[PDB]
Amino acid sequence: DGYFPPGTSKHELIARASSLKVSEVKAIIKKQVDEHWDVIRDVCGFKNKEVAYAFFFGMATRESTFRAATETGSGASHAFGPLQTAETAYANANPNYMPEHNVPEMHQYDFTEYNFYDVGISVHMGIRHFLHFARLAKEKYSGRDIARHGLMGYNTGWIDGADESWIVRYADETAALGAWYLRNNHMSDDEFTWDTDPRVDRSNPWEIYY
Ligand SMILES: OC[C@H]1O[C@@H](O[C@H]2[C@H](O)[C@@H](O)[C@H](O[C@H]3[C@H](O)[C@@H](O)[C@H](O)O[C@@H]3CO)O[C@@H]2CO)[C@H](O)[C@@H](O)[C@@H]1O
Ligand SMILES: OC[C@H]1O[C@@H](O[C@H]2[C@H](O)[C@@H](O)[C@H](O[C@H]3[C@H](O)[C@@H](O)[C@H](O)O[C@@H]3CO)O[C@@H]2CO)[C@H](O)[C@@H](O)[C@@H]1O
Ligand code: NI
Structure with a gap:
C-alpha cells in the first residue's frame, strides 16, 4: 500500500504529496479500489x-x-x-x-x-475508515443511504444526527462531484472540479452509482 519509500521523512512525504499530479492521485485511488x-x-x-x-x-x-x-x-x-x-x-x-x-x-x-x-x-x-462507517450505516440504511450516511460518519464521527444542511453540502455534494469525472471523461487526466463548482450537475446525484 505504501507509495513513497519507507524511511522517507515527514517533510519529504508532505512535499512529495503536494507535487503529485491530479492524474497520479487518481491512479493511487483506483489501485486501492x-x-x-x-x-x-x-x-x-x-x-x-x-x-x-x-x-x-x-x-x-x-x-x-x-x-x-x-x-x-x-x-x-x-x-x-x-x-x-x-x-x-x-x-x-x-x-x-x-x-x-x-x-x-x-x-x-x-x-x-x-x-x-x-x-x-x-x-x-x-x-x-469510510467503510467502517458505511458498514455501520448498512445496519439501518439501504441503497444510496449506506454511502450518504457512511459519509456523514466519515466526516463527523456519526452516521446520524448532522444538520440536514450538511448532508447536502457534504455528502450529496460528494456524489455530484464524483459523477462530473465520469460524465466528462476525467477519470484518468489531470482535470478536477471543486466544491460549489456551478458546472456540476447536482440533480439526483446518487443515481449514477447504483
Ligand atoms: O462519546 C463517545 C466517544 O466520543 C469520542 O469522540 C469522538 C467524537 O464524538 C466524534 O465526533 C469524532 O469523529 C471524528 C471522526 O472520527 C473523523 O473521521 C472526523 O475527521 O472528525 C470527527 C470529529 O470531527 O471521533 C471522536 C473519537 O472517536 C471521545 O473521544 C470518547 O471519549 C467518547 O467516549
Ligand atoms: O468540511 C468538509 C471538508 O472540507 C475540506 O475543505 C474543503 C472546503 O470545504 C471546500 O469549500 C473547498 O472548496 C474550495 C476549493 O478548495 C478552492 O480551490 C475553490 O476555488 O473554491 C472551493 C469552494 O470554496 O475545498 C476544501 C478542500 O480543498 C477540508 O479540507 C476537510 O478536512 C473537510 O473534512
Ligand atoms: Ni490497500
Whole structure:
C-alpha cells in the first residue's frame, strides 16, 4: 500500500504529496479500489468499479480539491491526504478514539508518521475508515443511504444526527462531484472540479452509482 519509500521523512512525504499530479492521485485511488473492490461492493452496493472510482474521486474533490498534501484539524479530526483520512482511522492512535474493528477485509495500519503522511497508506486508510462507517450505516440504511450516511460518519464521527444542511453540502455534494469525472471523461487526466463548482450537475446525484 505504501507509495513513497519507507524511511522517507515527514517533510519529504508532505512535499512529495503536494507535487503529485491530479492524474497520479487518481491512479493511487483506483489501485486501492481495485485491491478492495469486493468489500467496497459488499458494503456499498456500487454498480461497478468505474462508479466506485468516481465516488472516491468525489471524496478527494470534496475533502482536498485533489491537493494530496492537505492537512487539517486537531486530535480526532486531525486529517491528511487526498481523502482527509483522520487519526481515528488508525490502530493505536489514541485511547479515546472509538474503535474501527469492523473492516477485517482491510489491514488497519498502526498510527505512525509514515502511515499517516504516506499518500498510499493515507488513501488505503481513508477507504477503510469510510467503510467502517458505511458498514455501520448498512445496519439501518439501504441503497444510496449506506454511502450518504457512511459519509456523514466519515466526516463527523456519526452516521446520524448532522444538520440536514450538511448532508447536502457534504455528502450529496460528494456524489455530484464524483459523477462530473465520469460524465466528462476525467477519470484518468489531470482535470478536477471543486466544491460549489456551478458546472456540476447536482440533480439526483446518487443515481449514477447504483
Ligand atoms: O468540511 C468538509 C471538508 O472540507 C475540506 O475543505 C474543503 C472546503 O470545504 C471546500 O469549500 C473547498 O472548496 C474550495 C476549493 O478548495 C478552492 O480551490 C475553490 O476555488 O473554491 C472551493 C469552494 O470554496 O475545498 C476544501 C478542500 O480543498 C477540508 O479540507 C476537510 O478536512 C473537510 O473534512
Ligand atoms: O462519546 C463517545 C466517544 O466520543 C469520542 O469522540 C469522538 C467524537 O464524538 C466524534 O465526533 C469524532 O469523529 C471524528 C471522526 O472520527 C473523523 O473521521 C472526523 O475527521 O472528525 C470527527 C470529529 O470531527 O471521533 C471522536 C473519537 O472517536 C471521545 O473521544 C470518547 O471519549 C467518547 O467516549
Ligand atoms: Ni490497500
